[PDB]
Design a protein around this motif. Structure first.
Motif: not given
Ligand SMILES: *[C@@H]1O[C@H](CO)[C@@H](O[C@@H]2O[C@H](CO)[C@@H](O[C@@H]3O[C@H](CO)[C@@H](O)[C@H](O[C@H]4O[C@H](CO)[C@@H](O)[C@H](O)[C@@H]4O)[C@@H]3O)[C@H](O)[C@H]2NC(C)=O)[C@H](O)[C@H]1NC(C)=O
Ligand SMILES: *[C@@H]1O[C@H](CO)[C@@H](O[C@@H]2O[C@H](CO)[C@@H](O[C@@H]3O[C@H](CO)[C@@H](O)[C@H](O[C@H]4O[C@H](CO)[C@@H](O)[C@H](O)[C@@H]4O)[C@@H]3O)[C@H](O)[C@H]2NC(C)=O)[C@H](O)[C@H]1NC(C)=O
Ligand SMILES: C=CC[C@H](NC(=O)N[C@@H](CCCCNC(=O)c1ccc(I)cc1)C(=O)O)C(=O)O
Ligand SMILES: C=CC[C@H](NC(=O)N[C@@H](CCCCNC(=O)c1ccc(I)cc1)C(=O)O)C(=O)O
Ligand SMILES: *[C@@H]1O[C@H](CO)[C@@H](O[C@@H]2O[C@H](CO)[C@@H](O)[C@H](O)[C@H]2NC(C)=O)[C@H](O)[C@H]1NC(C)=O
Ligand SMILES: *[C@@H]1O[C@H](CO)[C@@H](O[C@@H]2O[C@H](CO)[C@@H](O)[C@H](O)[C@H]2NC(C)=O)[C@H](O)[C@H]1NC(C)=O
Ligand SMILES: *[C@@H]1O[C@H](CO)[C@@H](O[C@@H]2O[C@H](CO)[C@@H](O)[C@H](O)[C@H]2NC(C)=O)[C@H](O)[C@H]1NC(C)=O
Ligand SMILES: *[C@@H]1O[C@H](CO)[C@@H](O[C@@H]2O[C@H](CO)[C@@H](O)[C@H](O)[C@H]2NC(C)=O)[C@H](O)[C@H]1NC(C)=O
Ligand SMILES: *[C@@H]1O[C@H](CO)[C@@H](O[C@@H]2O[C@H](CO)[C@@H](O)[C@H](O)[C@H]2NC(C)=O)[C@H](O)[C@H]1NC(C)=O
Ligand SMILES: *[C@@H]1O[C@H](CO)[C@@H](O[C@@H]2O[C@H](CO)[C@@H](O)[C@H](O)[C@H]2NC(C)=O)[C@H](O)[C@H]1NC(C)=O
Ligand SMILES: *[C@@H]1O[C@H](CO)[C@@H](O)[C@H](O)[C@H]1NC(C)=O
Ligand SMILES: *[C@@H]1O[C@H](CO)[C@@H](O)[C@H](O)[C@H]1NC(C)=O
Ligand SMILES: *[C@@H]1O[C@H](CO)[C@@H](O)[C@H](O)[C@H]1NC(C)=O
Ligand SMILES: *[C@@H]1O[C@H](CO)[C@@H](O)[C@H](O)[C@H]1NC(C)=O
Ligand SMILES: *[C@@H]1O[C@H](CO)[C@@H](O)[C@H](O)[C@H]1NC(C)=O
Ligand SMILES: *[C@@H]1O[C@H](CO)[C@@H](O)[C@H](O)[C@H]1NC(C)=O
Ligand SMILES: [Ca+2]
Ligand SMILES: [Ca+2]
Ligand SMILES: [Cl-]
Ligand SMILES: [Cl-]
Ligand SMILES: [Zn+2]
Ligand SMILES: [Zn+2]
Ligand SMILES: [Zn+2]
Ligand SMILES: [Zn+2]
Lengths: 694, 694
Positions: A110, A205, A212-213, A216, A232-235, A296
């Protein structure tokens, strides 16, 4: 007869060894065809073993891979632009390993793409307190620098996030022999130590329980709406790459600037461990350049889900699950757990073929893509959250069975402490000098509780494994157990060969557990728990154990707040409400335990069991924690400084952390009070679910 | 025997009349001592009637009152600053009413303070479409103006919010005789019409399901953390005051600017209904000045909660609840419902004293402060959400029993349609020309379904009453029923005397229901439902009814989207997933109904009932709707244009509303697709809770 002992005795060391061997001959990287083949093999064998149904559940999730024809690497670059040193492009593969081209080179899953060049700053383990030491005591500024950090202590994704918040433009992670080289043992393949060319893979992450980013809250199914990469959530937002200690020695040895602040900043390499920024004198003109070209991509993943329908309460689910995807061969992580899970299914299937069924339904899972941030377990749980919320009794994790051979290690909810204690008193210790003795006794002797003597240590659940969504988001009682090393100090580092190409079948078979006796013990603990959870008439949960730990936790958070007595006075910060709630909980739980001993009637039984099952659920706040909508458990969350560690009263602990540096102290302490109220209200509410129902 | 007919026959018209009389002799405003006295009286009578336990549950919540010595009023002010006309300070009290000083004058609860002066703009009913007509077709700008709007059509808090979003600095609300004066009937006290000096009170919150504006998510208990007024959840930000039609005629008659766009903008007053801004020619120098001095204050409120413990499933709760607090005497709203609730408790207590118990536990509630935005029911439900989530079978509302005497009116979840149908076939019609006939037949004849003939109309639940938190936030099946007028057109306006001082015992007794036969019918419907929900062996819910309406709703939202065919193509907007989910739901629900007929075994029964009970729960999205964390039901929400109305597929409907005026069409249609996916995933998930459990 068909009882727990029959079950325990059907488990054989030799079967586990056959399975481990079968599962580790080739790489099973998430999203690859080899991994899909292994899923089809599991599915079809779980049918043979006797399960009622076995199905593949697939999701299309964001995964991350190196570019096969533009490899990642790091350079020292000179003034003229010449790359004068290059890190390796792959680890020397282990002896006898044929299909090399298929081994994924080391990378940080990631990482975004980038070619940053800069001056190096060495940040130790890149923990919150290391960054505080750098910026606040040594007044060294990371903005625009490349940080080099050693692996260990804390989850690698916390390191990357600390480096981002400090302004770094890139992160190099490496394995120091201080943390990954046990003195007096040989490097693999002659010992269980990490060689100089070995490298720990792993996602970086910023974990937030989302799965899955791109999706959510919802399963990554076929018609799913996906967020763009930017939301995207925690990239992470800076490039990251891992190296071994030979390459790291080359980067560290030229370093200048300031001396390390003290010796807890030194590993074992023959270098000064200077903090930087930059190289010394002669090389002050040289720079470090990263080349990160990973991509990705949305990739299909497959969970295997086996069902063994309950005879009496088929609508109550006990889940045993572990992952199947590995970085390379997965000798320990995860196939030593998957092999144990296969032997458990085989053993439940045997009793099943003789006509027995568990009282409750058992679900077995082989999760995919756990290595990319718990994606298989999390998507499945988003898909089935309604069934799990109303029906899930317990979740037992089964990642790696061993990580050493010294003693047992257990993390679980307090609701399962008495179960773990009773079960291990009935199991044999496999430890040398403890034959004839129980697993409880060897465990207690080698790993004592810091609180009460005559009891073993049981830790708090955080994140880092597939129990996370069951426990932290859904509030289903969860537990895990494995065999571990003596080295309490390195308990978050991983064993030396963790996530490298050297984790092989030979590793386990020659150095960890030649007789497969530690695996057999672990199978008995995890199978035994699943058996009791699934077959006991009263669920084997003791709410009085929750009452005891709530009071330690309350004492603890109160203690942290009392390092600020003047602010506690000025802002009227009172923990009275939380102590009163914990007191009420203690009282109500012990009245409840009495009625539980003192009641034949199936409805009364189903009602008391529902109070037990829903008790974990009652700690869930539907609003989640601040900025963390998927960390919903008010008592436990992964630590914000270390996703591997559990933190207790996480809402209050985060409001208090570094509170003296908040610029508006009135608003900061107002937020502490708010969290005390939330924790107090939630403990009282949970307690009232154990009162007489009417 | 102890069956439903015994229960129905214990209900007497004369007892309801005694109770209504007793409950309406003095004002019971939320937070006052008189209201607390009535709570203590209820509590102690519910004990006498026979309940197992009856308790007060208190909360300290934000309430709103006029200032006793600085009254609210509106003026016409001239150029020199002289107030040349003043609206009245109180309504002429009804005949024979003694304790006058204790009648709260008309005000809009939760208005902030302010003295704005400006030009008047008349905005009709201040609906979204009236503001569109003003600003978009007539190009008239409300910014900096005082808007005068007539009550009716939509909840008054939507009007205030529309006026705020359009830039108004104040809002005057008034009752037009077009909406509140039924032709050919006399004004009170000689008829049931609103006199010129009468005025509708009521809160103007921007309702968002939160309850106490200071403590969203958590009960307003003794140690609660409160938000500051500035962060408070749904408080309007401009001053608002209500007036009667005599005062309004004085404000409207001078108005100039533009003519009304058409006749649906005209009420019945003798004025031109000019839109403004401002007065005509001679008076263009005069202004309107508001004087609003109301104060917000944290006040204690009291819910009465009575428990009648179940004999077999005491951990399953059927709740019958209504409010007790009124604006003034509460002749219709709420004491005509409270009187019915008292007669139901009395009747259940009678059977109880003869040794009968319901199978499930029944909870009776007398809620407080419903008039200030559902505060009593909402705080109680935040306190007990864990018990209600896992145990709540159904909620039956009992606010006003009558609002006319023409026919029955019912809003409930589809899960209760068949129950309502069957129960009303077994009840007598109290309607003239229908003696000997069933309530179902009279109801069906007078109020036909627009879809299927031979069926009566049942509407969707929105907000506006205490069922809201049970249904929209917690997903507990909910229902309500009352007697209503013929006037389908005014179905959101309230009856003429709604929320004024003239709603008295004499009003009901002389004009609505002299024989108390409509109240008796309503008691039989609400008691009957509570009886069946509480005593039937299989819960009386039919999931096939949900399958039928989901498909109407899907057809409907698809139709709204298809007014934009070109954008549907360009952005690939597909409802395929949602139709497939509704199809699967239809299939699974009908397999489920078969197993429900085709299964004695208490566990199998408890499992099927749990599937029925949790079916409503399965439509709850734990993330809530966009910007509406407390509207969690994915199928139903209060309409954003009218909190009294339910909207179906509210997530998709809001993403689509006024979509052509979105400036970034790609991002707007991306958000429609996201909501289709959420609705599709939720219908499928709900459907899978009805599959075989294993
Ligand atoms: C743990 O369990 C205990 C006891 O079982 C529970 O006790 C409750 O505490 C509250 C106080 O927080 C009590 O509240 C009081 O209720 C009475 C009426 O019953 C009121 O008269 C009181 O109000 C007066 O006093 C207030 C404070 O001094 C004033 O602010 C107020 O204006 C009034 O003048 C007061 O509200 C409640 O009665 C008990 N419940 C019992 C005894 O059953 C305690 O709350 C639990 N802990 C937690 C954290 O939930
Ligand atoms: C309503 O119920 C139905 C049927 O009971 C349920 O059907 C499911 O539909 C999905 C498609 O949305 C099916 O997914 C397929 O599964 C197979 C393996 O079993 C795969 O081979 C397929 O993947 C290929 O095709 C995709 C699309 O063309 C490609 O993108 C992909 O790359 C592959 O090449 C595909 O994913 C699923 O099998 C069924 N389940 C069944 C039949 O049991 C439907 O989803 C339900 N509706 C809703 C809204 O949930
Ligand atoms: C989401 C993370 C993916 C992956 N997870 C993972 O590699 N998990 C391993 C972690 C091993 C080192 C830290 N160990 C622990 O945190 C631990 C906790 C409880 C027990 I009983 C034993 C060890 C894993 O959980 O096995 C990663 O860490 O890269
Ligand atoms: C939160 C609102 C407080 C108060 N609520 C309230 O005054 N509720 C009344 C509303 C009466 C007029 C609109 N009627 C309806 O919306 C309705 C819906 C279903 C049925 I069966 C019957 C009428 C109330 O709900 O009785 C208010 O509206 O000011
Ligand atoms: C691991 O075990 C399985 C099953 O014992 C082996 O797969 C079987 O292989 C034979 C020969 O190819 C086939 O006839 C069967 O179809 C397979 N059974 C399955 C897929 O369930 C598998 O080849 C072994 N793997 C390794 C690496 O030894
Ligand atoms: C490290 O690797 C790089 C890239 O493969 C090497 O630099 C390249 O070398 C060739 C041949 O001299 C040149 O034509 C390329 O243009 C160079 N590329 C770049 C990006 O510099 C470099 O020589 C290697 N260094 C060492 C010490 O092996
Ligand atoms: C673990 O074992 C203990 C001791 O055997 C169990 O506690 C006993 O349980 C029986 C059956 O209810 C009681 O009558 C005894 O009084 C208990 N002894 C105690 C509390 O010291 C305990 O319940 C077991 N825990 C489980 C299965 O969760
Ligand atoms: C409404 O009904 C109640 C009860 O029937 C009346 O309250 C009772 O009044 C008598 C005389 O004051 C007392 O002896 C009792 O203590 C009361 N009973 C209670 C409080 O449960 C009440 O006064 C009636 N109210 C009106 C306005 O008529
Ligand atoms: C409407 O009410 C206001 C306020 O009570 C009246 O204006 C006041 O009248 C007295 C006596 O003339 C003055 O001394 C005050 O200073 C005035 N106050 C204000 C705020 O203007 C006004 O006269 C009334 N108008 C009518 C038509 O009755
Ligand atoms: C409402 O009444 C109908 C008709 O009486 C009920 O449907 C019948 O229920 C019995 C018992 O299961 C069935 O065997 C009949 O076949 C049903 N007739 C039908 C469907 O036409 C219906 O179940 C009742 N609904 C309730 C109580 O919710
Ligand atoms: C891998 O290498 C190069 C980078 O431009 C190119 O051939 C290809 O696009 C890359 N592969 C990807 C992005 O999947
Ligand atoms: C540190 O880094 C950069 C120097 O370029 C600067 O912009 C930033 O403000 C600095 N912060 C501190 C605390 O020195
Ligand atoms: C297994 O235990 C033995 C005996 O203490 C020891 O030689 C070895 O270090 C252990 N293996 C590992 C991997 O710790
Ligand atoms: C009511 O009237 C005046 C306004 O200043 C004053 O006596 C008092 O503060 C007000 N009451 C309140 C604010 O409760
Ligand atoms: C309308 O109102 C004010 C006039 O003062 C102005 O500032 C605002 O921009 C105007 N908007 C439109 C659409 O006319
Ligand atoms: C009650 O019904 C009668 C007969 O239709 C009628 O006189 C009266 O209008 C009704 N009352 C109300 C309040 O609608
Ligand atoms: Ca997801
Ligand atoms: Ca609240
Ligand atoms: Cl594990
Ligand atoms: Cl109602
Ligand atoms: Zn693992
Ligand atoms: Zn791992
Ligand atoms: Zn009401
Ligand atoms: Zn009302």
């Amino acid at each position: 007869k068909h009882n727990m002992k029959a079950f325990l005795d059907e488990l054989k060391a030799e079967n586990i060894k056959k399975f481990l061997y079968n599962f580790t001959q080739i790489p099973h990287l998430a999203g690859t065809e080899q991994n899909f083949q292994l899923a089809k093999q599991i599915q079809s064998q779980w049918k043979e073993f006797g399960l009622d149904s076995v199905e593949l559940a697939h999701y299309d999730v964001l995964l991350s891979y190196p570019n096969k024809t533009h490899p990642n690497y790091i350079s020292i670059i000179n003034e003229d632009g010449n790359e004068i040193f290059n890190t390796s492009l792959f680890e020397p593969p282990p002896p006898g390993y044929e299909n090399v081209s298929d081994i994924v080179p080391p990378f940080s899953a990631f990482s975004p793409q980038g070619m940053p060049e800069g001056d190096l700053v060495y940040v130790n383990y890149a923990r919150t307190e290391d960054f505080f030491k750098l910026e606040r005591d040594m007044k060294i500024n990371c903005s625009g620098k490349i940080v080099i950090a050693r692996y260990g202590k804390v989850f690698r994704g916390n390191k990357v996030k600390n480096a981002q918040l400090a302004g770094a433009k890139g992160v190099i992670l490496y394995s120091d022999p201080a943390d990954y080289f046990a003195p007096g043992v040989k490097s693999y393949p002659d010992g269980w130590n990490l060689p100089g060319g070995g490298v720990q893979r792993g996602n970086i992450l910023n974990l937030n329980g989302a799965g899955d980013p791109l999706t959510p809250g919802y399963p990554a199914n076929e018609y799913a709406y996906r967020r763009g990469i930017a939301e995207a959530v925690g990239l992470p937002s800076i490039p990251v790459h891992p190296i071994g200690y030979y390459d790291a020695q080359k980067l560290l040895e030229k370093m200048g600037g300031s001396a390390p602040p003290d010796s807890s900043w030194r590993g074992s390499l023959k270098v000064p461990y200077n903090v930087g920024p930059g190289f010394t004198g002669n090389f002050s003109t040289q720079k470090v350049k990263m080349h990160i070209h990973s991509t990705n991509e949305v990739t299909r993943i497959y969970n295997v889900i086996g069902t063994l329908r309950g005879a009496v309460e088929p609508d109550r689910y006990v889940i045993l699950g572990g992952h199947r995807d590995s970085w390379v061969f997965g000798g320990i992580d995860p196939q030593s757990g998957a092999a144990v899970v296969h032997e458990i299914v085989r053993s439940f299937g045997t009793l099943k073929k003789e006509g027995w069924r568990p009282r409750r339904t058992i679900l077995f899972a082989s999760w995919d893509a756990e290595e990319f941030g718990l994606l298989g377990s999390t998507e499945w749980a988003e898909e089935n959250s309604r069934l799990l919320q109303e029906r899930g009794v317990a979740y037992i994790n089964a990642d790696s069975s061993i990580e050493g051979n010294y003693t047992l290690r257990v993390d679980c909810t307090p609701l399962m402490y008495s179960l773990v204690h009773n079960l291990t008193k009935e199991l044999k210790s496999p430890d040398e000098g403890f034959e004839g003795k129980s697993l409880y006794e060897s465990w207690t002797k080698k790993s004592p509780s810091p609180e009460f003597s005559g009891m073993p240590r049981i830790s708090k659940l955080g994140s880092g494994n597939d129990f996370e969504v069951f426990f932290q988001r859904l509030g289903i009682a969860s537990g895990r157990a494995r065999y571990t090393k003596n080295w309490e100090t390195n308990k978050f580092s991983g064993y030396p060969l963790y996530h490298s190409v050297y984790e092989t079948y030979e590793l386990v078979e020659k150095f960890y557990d030649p007789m497969f006796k530690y695996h057999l013990t672990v199978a008995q603990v995890r199978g035994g728990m699943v058996f009791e959870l699934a077959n006991s008439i009263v669920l084997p949960f003791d709410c009085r154990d929750y009452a005891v730990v709530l009071r330690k936790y309350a004492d603890k958070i109160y203690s942290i707040s009392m390092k600020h007595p003047q602010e506690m006075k000025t802002y009227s910060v009172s923990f009275d409400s939380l102590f009163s709630a914990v007191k009420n909980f203690t009282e109500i739980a012990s009245k409840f335990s009495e009625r539980l001993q003192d009641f034949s009637n199936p409805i009364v039984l189903r009602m008391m069991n529902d109070q037990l099952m829903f008790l974990e659920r009652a700690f869930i706040d539907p609003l989640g924690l601040p900025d963390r909508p998927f960390y919903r458990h008010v008592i436990y969350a992964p630590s914000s400084h270390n996703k591997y560690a559990g933190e207790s009263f996480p809402g209050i602990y985060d409001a208090l952390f570094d509170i003296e540096s908040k610029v508006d102290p009135s608003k900061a302490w107002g937020e502490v009070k708010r969290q005390i109220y939330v924790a107090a209200f939630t403990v009282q509410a949970a307690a009232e679910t154990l009162s007489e129902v009417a």
